Amino acid sequence: SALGKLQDVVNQNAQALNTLVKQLSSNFGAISSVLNDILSRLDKVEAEV
């Protein structure tokens, strides 16, 4: 616990990076999180939404 501040900063940076790289798996109301599965299941007028 002597170097807790630097370790905490590193852990916060790593957690921010992990959250930013994990937010891609979310749907955000869409049908899927993968663009290939969306551009190959709907037409060019409904997949745009």
Place this chain on the structure above:
Amino acid sequence: DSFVIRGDEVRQIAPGQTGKIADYNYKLPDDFTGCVIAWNSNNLDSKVG
């Protein structure tokens, strides 16, 4: 653009649709700005023979 089609093929004139007429001889772009005008001409073009 003046042309004659089937009464069931009117829905194919809308942009971003499907159909044999809408994909082989006539097609509107996705950024079409205008109005589509259509009317019945059975007593004008159709012939008894």
